[PDB]
Short mmCIF file of C-alpha atoms and ligand atoms in Angstrom, two decimals:
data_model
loop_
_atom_site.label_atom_id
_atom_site.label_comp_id
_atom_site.label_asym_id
_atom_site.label_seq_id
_atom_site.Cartn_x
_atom_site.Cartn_y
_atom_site.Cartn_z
CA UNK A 1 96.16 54.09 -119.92
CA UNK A 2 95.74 56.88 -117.72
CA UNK A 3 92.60 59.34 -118.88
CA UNK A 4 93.34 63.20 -118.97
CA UNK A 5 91.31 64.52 -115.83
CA UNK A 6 93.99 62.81 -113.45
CA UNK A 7 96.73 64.51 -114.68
CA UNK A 8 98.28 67.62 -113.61
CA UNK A 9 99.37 69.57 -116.34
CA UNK A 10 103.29 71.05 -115.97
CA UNK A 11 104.25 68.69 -113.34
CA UNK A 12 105.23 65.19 -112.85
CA UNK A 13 101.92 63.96 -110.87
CA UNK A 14 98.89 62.19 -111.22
CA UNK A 15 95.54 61.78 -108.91
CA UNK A 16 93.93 58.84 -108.13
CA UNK A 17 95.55 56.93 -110.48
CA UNK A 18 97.29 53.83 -109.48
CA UNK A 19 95.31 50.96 -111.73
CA UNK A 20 96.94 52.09 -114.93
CA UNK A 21 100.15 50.54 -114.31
CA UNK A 22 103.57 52.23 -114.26
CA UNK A 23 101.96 56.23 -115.47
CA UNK A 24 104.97 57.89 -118.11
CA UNK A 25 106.33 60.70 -116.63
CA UNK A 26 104.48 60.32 -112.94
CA UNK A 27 107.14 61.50 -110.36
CA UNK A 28 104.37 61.66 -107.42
CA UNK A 29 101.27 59.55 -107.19
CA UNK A 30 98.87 61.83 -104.89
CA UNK A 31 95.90 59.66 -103.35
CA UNK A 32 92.38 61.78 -102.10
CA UNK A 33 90.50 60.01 -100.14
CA UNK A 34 90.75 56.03 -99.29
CA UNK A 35 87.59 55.04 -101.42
CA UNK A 36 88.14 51.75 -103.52
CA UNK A 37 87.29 53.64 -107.01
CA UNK A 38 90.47 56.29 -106.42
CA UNK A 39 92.39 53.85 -104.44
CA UNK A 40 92.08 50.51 -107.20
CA UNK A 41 95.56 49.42 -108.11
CA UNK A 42 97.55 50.31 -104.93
CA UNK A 43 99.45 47.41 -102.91
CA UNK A 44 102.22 46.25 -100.50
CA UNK A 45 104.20 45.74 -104.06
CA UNK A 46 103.64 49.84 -105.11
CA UNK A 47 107.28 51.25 -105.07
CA UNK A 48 106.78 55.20 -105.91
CA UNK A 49 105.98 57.92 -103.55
CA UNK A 50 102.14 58.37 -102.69
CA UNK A 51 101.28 61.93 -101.12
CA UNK A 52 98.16 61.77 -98.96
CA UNK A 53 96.49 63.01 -94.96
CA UNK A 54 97.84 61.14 -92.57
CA UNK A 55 94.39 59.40 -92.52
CA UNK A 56 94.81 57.90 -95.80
CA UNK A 57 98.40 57.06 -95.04
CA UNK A 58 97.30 55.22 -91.97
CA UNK A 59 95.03 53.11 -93.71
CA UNK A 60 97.40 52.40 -96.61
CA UNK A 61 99.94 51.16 -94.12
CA UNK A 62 97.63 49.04 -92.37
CA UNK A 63 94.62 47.77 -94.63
CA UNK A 64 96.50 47.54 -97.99
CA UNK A 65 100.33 47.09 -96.07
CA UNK A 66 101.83 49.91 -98.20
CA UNK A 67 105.38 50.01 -96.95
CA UNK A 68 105.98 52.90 -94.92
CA UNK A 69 109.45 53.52 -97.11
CA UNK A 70 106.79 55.05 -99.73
CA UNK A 71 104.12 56.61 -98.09
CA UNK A 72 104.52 60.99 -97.21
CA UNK A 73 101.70 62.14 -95.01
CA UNK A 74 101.19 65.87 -95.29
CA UNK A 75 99.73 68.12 -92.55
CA UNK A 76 96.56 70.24 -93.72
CA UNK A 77 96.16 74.10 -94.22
CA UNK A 78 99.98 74.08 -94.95
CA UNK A 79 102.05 75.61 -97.86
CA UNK A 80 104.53 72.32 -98.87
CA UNK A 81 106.86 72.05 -101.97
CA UNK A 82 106.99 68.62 -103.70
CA UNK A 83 109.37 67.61 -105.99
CA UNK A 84 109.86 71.59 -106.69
CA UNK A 85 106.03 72.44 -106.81
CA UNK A 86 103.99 74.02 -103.71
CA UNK A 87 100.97 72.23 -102.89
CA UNK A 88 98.32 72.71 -100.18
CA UNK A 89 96.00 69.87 -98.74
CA UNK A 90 92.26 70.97 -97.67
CA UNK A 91 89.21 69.55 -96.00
CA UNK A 92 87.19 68.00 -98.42
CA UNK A 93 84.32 67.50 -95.96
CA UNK A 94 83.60 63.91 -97.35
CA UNK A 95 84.92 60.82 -95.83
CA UNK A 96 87.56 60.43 -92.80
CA UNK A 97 90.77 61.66 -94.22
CA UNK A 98 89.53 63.32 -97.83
CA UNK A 99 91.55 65.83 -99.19
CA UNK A 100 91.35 68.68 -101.61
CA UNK A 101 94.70 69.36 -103.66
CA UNK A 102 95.83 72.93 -104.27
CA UNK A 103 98.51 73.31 -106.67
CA UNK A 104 101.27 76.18 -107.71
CA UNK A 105 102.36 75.68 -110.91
CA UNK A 106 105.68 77.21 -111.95
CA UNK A 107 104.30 78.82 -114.77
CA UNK A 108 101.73 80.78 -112.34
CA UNK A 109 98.73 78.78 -112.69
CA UNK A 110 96.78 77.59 -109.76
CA UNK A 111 94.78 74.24 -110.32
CA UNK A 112 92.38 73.11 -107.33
CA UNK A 113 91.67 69.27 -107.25
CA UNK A 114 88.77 68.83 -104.75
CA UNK A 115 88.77 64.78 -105.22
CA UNK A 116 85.40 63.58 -103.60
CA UNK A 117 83.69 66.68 -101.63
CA UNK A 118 80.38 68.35 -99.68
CA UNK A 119 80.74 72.14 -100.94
CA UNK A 120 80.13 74.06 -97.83
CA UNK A 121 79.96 77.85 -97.05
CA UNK A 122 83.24 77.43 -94.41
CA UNK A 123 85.25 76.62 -97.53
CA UNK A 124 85.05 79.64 -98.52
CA UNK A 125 87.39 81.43 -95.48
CA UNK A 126 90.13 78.12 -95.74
CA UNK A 127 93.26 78.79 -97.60
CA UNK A 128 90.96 79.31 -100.87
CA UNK A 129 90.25 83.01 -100.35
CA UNK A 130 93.64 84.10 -100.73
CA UNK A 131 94.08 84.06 -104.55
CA UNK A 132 92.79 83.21 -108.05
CA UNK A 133 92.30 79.69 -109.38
CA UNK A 134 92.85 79.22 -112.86
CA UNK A 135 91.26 75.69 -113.20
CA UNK A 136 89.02 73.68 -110.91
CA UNK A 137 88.97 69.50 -111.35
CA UNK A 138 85.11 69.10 -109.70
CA UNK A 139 83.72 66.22 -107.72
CA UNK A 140 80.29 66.46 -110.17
CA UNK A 141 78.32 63.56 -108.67
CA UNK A 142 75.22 65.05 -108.49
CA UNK A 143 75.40 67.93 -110.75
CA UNK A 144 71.60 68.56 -112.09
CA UNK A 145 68.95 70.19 -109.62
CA UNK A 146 66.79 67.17 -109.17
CA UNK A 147 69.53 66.36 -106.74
CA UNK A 148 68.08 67.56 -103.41
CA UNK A 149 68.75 66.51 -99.75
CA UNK A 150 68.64 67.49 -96.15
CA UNK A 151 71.73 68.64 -94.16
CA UNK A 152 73.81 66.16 -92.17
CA UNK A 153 72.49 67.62 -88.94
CA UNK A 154 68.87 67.11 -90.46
CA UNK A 155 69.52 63.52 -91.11
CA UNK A 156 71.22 63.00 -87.86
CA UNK A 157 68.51 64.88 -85.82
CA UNK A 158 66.12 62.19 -87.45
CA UNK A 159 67.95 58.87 -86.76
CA UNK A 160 69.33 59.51 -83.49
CA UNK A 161 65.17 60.43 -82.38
CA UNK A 162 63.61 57.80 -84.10
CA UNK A 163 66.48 54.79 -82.79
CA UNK A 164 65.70 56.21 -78.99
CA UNK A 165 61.91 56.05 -79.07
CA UNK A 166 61.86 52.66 -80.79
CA UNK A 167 64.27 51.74 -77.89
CA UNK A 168 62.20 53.12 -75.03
CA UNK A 169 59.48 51.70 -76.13
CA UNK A 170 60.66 48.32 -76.48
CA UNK A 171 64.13 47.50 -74.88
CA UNK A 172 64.66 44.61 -76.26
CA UNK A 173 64.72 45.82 -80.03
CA UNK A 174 68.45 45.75 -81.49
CA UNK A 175 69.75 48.68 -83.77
CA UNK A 176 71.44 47.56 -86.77
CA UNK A 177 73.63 49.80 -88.99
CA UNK A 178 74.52 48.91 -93.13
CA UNK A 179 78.01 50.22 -93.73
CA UNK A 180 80.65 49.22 -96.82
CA UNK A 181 83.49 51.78 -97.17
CA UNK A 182 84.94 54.48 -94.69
CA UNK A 183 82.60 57.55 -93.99
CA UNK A 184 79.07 58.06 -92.41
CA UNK A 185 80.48 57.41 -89.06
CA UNK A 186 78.42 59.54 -87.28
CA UNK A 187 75.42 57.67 -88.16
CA UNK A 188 76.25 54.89 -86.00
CA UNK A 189 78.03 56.78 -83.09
CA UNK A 190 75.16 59.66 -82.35
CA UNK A 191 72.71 56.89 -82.75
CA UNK A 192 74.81 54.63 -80.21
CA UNK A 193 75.79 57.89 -77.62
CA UNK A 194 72.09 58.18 -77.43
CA UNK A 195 71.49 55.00 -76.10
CA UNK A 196 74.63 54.57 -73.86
CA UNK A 197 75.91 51.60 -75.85
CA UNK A 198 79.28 51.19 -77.65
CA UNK A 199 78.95 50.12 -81.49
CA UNK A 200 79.69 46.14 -81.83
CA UNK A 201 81.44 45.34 -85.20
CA UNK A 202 83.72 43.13 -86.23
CA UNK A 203 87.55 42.67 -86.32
CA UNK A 204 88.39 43.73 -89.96
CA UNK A 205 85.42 46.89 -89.48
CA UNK A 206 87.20 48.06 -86.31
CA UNK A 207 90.91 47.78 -87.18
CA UNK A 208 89.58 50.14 -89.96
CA UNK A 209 88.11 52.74 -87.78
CA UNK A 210 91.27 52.73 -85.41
CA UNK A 211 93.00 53.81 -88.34
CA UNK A 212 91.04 57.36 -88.43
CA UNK A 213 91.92 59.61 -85.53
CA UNK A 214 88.82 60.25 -84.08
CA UNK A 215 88.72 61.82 -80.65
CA UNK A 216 87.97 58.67 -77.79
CA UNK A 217 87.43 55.96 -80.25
CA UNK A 218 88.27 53.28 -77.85
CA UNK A 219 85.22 54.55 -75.78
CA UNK A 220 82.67 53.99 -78.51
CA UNK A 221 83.42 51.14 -80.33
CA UNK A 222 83.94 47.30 -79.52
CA UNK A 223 84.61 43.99 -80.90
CA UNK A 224 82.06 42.07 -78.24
CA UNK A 225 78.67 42.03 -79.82
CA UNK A 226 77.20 40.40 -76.74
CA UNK A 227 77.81 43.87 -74.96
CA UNK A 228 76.13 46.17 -77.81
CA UNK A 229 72.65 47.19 -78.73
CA UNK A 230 74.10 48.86 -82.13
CA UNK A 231 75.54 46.68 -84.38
CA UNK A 232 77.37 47.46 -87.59
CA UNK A 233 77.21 45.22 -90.51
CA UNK A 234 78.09 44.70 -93.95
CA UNK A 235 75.58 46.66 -96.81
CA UNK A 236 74.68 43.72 -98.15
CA UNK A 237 73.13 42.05 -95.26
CA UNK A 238 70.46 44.78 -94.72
CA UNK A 239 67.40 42.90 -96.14
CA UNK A 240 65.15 40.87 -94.43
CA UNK A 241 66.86 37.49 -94.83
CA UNK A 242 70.08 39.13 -93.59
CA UNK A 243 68.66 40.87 -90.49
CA UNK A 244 66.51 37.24 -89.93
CA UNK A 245 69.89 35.32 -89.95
CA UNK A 246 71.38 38.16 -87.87
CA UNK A 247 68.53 37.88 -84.94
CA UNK A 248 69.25 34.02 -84.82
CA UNK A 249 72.38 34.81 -83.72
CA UNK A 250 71.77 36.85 -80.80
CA UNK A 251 70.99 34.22 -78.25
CA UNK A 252 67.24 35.18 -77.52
CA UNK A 253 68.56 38.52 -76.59
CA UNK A 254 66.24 40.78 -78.50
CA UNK A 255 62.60 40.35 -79.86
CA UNK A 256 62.63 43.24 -83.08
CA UNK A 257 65.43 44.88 -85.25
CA UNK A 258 65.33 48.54 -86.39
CA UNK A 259 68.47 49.22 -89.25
CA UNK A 260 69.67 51.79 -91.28
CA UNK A 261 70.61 52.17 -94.88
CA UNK A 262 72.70 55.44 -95.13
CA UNK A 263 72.35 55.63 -98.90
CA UNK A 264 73.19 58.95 -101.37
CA UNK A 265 70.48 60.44 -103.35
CA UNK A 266 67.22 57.94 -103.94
CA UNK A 267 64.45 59.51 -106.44
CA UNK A 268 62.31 59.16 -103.21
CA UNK A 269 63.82 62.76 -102.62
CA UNK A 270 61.75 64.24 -105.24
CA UNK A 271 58.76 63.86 -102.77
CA UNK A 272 59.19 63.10 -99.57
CA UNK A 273 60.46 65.50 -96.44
CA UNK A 274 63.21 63.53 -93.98
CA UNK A 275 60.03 64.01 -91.14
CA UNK A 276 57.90 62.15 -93.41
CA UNK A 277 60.24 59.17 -93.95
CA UNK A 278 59.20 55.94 -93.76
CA UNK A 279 60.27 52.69 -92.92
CA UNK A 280 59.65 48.83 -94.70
CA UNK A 281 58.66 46.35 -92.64
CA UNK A 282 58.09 42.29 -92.48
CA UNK A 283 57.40 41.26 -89.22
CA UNK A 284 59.64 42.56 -86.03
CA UNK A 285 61.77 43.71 -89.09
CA UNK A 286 61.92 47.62 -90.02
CA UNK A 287 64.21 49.04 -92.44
CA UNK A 288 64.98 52.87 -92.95
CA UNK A 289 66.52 54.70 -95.99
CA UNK A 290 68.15 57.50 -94.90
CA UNK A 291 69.69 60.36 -97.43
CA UNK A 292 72.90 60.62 -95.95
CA UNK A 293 75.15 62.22 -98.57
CA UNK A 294 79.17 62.95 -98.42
CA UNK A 295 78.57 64.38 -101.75
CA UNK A 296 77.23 68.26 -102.29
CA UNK A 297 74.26 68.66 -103.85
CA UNK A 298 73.22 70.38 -106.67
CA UNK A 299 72.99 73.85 -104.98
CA UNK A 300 75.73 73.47 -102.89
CA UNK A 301 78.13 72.98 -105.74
CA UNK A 302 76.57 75.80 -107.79
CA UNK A 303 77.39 78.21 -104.51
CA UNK A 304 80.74 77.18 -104.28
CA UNK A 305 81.84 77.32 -108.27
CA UNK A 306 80.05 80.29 -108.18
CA UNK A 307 82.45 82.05 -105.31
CA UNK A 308 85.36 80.66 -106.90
CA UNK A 309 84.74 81.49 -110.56
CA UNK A 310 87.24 79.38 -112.14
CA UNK A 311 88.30 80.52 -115.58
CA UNK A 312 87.83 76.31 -116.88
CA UNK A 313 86.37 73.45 -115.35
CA UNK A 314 87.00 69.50 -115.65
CA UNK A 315 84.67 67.44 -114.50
CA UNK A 316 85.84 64.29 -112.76
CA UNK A 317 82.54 62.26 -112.19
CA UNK A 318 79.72 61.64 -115.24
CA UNK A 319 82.39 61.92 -118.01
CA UNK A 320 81.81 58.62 -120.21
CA UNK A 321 78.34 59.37 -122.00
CA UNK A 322 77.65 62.31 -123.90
CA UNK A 323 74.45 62.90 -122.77
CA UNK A 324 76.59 63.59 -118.95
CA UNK A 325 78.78 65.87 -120.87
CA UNK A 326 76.58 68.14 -122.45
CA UNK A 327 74.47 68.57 -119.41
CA UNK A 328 76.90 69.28 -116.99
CA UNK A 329 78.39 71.78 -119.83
CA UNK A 330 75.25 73.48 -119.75
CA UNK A 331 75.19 74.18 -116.22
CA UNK A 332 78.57 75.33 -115.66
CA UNK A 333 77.51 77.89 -118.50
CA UNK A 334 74.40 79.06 -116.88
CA UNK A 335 76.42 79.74 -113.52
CA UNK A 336 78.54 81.72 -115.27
CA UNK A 337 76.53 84.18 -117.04
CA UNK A 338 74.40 84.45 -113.74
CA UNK A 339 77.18 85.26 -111.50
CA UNK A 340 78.81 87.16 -114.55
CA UNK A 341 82.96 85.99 -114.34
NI1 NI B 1 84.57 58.90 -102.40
#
């Protein structure tokens, strides 16, 4: 049964809900992001309309062979009326293809759904500035300040320099990149531009990114691994018995791997600056966390609730313990009396 926080009070539609069965009263099943956790349930055999970017409807069509009969793309930054509602889909800054959902109740409530998001400061001169919203349904991930990490461009800066001095050094070292799910792209494409190579992957990985619009794809990304010195692989195999069995496999091409592990937070962020990052290492083997996050942090979501000073919030992420519950209540208090809405 379908919980509370993905429904949308006064209208016929859900979000993110599609592994609940047949949802009473659901006249429009809108879809975020295409993550597995929001996605779970959806198939070729789903018969109701599902609203979504044109991202996510490409990859429903495609990966999970939605029929095209049921799928309704809608453009961004654009005022569109659904089954008798207006509705307005925003940048979410998370993933290829993530959306925010603003919705105009007939009553004259205004709910904002910001599915998965990175709060930034350019939200705040989108569509949003415009009017009042009522009640915000928050992406609360990492909501409780020991949640600290760099900027994007920080983490980028860091990867892209230390992948081309390990290269120029030695060019025979490979570049290997840990990926399981859409997003964190340009971890693997600034680190490949910077050493004039396209990104080798495999068949099911690249009819994925196909599916996401990006700007010159076809110049930057490859099914022959023979030509590449950045590979993409699966999460799992970044260890040093999957990067060993990897090497094997290169035909005596290269002598030493460097990879990446984009991960979210690690409690290795409660001491250590991205310069000072570190690698593990067995052999001709290193291994890099890096705290790549498509999530906002702490003080990033705290900026942005503040600005919009929503008279409730639901969280949508932490909401099974009670522990979660409380805290999160707590904070959302505290930025309130600060700001003073
Ligand atoms: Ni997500």
């Amino acid at each position: 049964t379908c919980p509370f926080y993905k429904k949308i009070p006064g209208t016929g539609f859900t979000v993110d809900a599609f592994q609940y069965g047949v949802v009473e009263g659901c006249t429009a099943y809108f879809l975020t992001h295409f993550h597995s956790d929001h996605y779970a349930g959806l198939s070729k055999h789903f018969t109701f309309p599902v609203y979504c970017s044109e991202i996510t409807g490409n990859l429903l069509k495609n990966k999970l062979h939605v029929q095209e009969q049921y799928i309704h793309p809608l453009p961004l930054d654009t005022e569109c009326i659904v089954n008798g509602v207006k509705v307005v889909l925003l940048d979410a800054n998370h993933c290829p293809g993530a959306v925010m959902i603003l919705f105009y109740l007939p009553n004259g409530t205004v709910i904002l759904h910001t599915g998965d998001f990175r709060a930034d400061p350019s939200m705040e001169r989108s569509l949003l500035a415009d009017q009042k919203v009522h009640m915000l349904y928050l992406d609360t991930t990492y909501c409780s300040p020991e949640y600290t990490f760099p900027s994007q461009q920080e983490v980028i800066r860091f990867a892209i320099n230390t992948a081309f001095e390990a290269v120029t050094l030695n060019p025979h070292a490979l570049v290997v990149c840990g990926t399981y799910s859409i997003g964190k792209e340009k971890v693997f494409l600034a680190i490949a531009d910077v050493l004039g190579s396209k990104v080798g992957m495999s068949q099911e990985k690249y009819k994925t990114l196909q599916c996401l619009n990006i700007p010159e794809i076809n110049s930057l990304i490859t099914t022959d691994m023979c030509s590449s010195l950045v590979h993409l692989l699966p999460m799992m195999q970044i260890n040093f018995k999957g990067l060993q069995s990897h090497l094997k496999k290169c035909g005596g091409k290269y002598n030493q791997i460097l990879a990446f592990r984009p991960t979210g937070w690690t409690h290795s962020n409660k001491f250590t600056r991205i310069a000072d990052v570190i690698p593990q290492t067995k052999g001709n083997i290193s291994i890099y966390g890096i705290p790549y996050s498509e999530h906002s942090s702490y003080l990033e979501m705290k900026r942005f609730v503040q600005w919009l000073k929503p008279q409730k919030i639901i969280p949508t992420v932490n909401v099974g313990t009670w522990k979660s519950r409380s805290t999160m209540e707590k904070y959302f208090r505290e930025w309130k009396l600060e700001a003073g809405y």
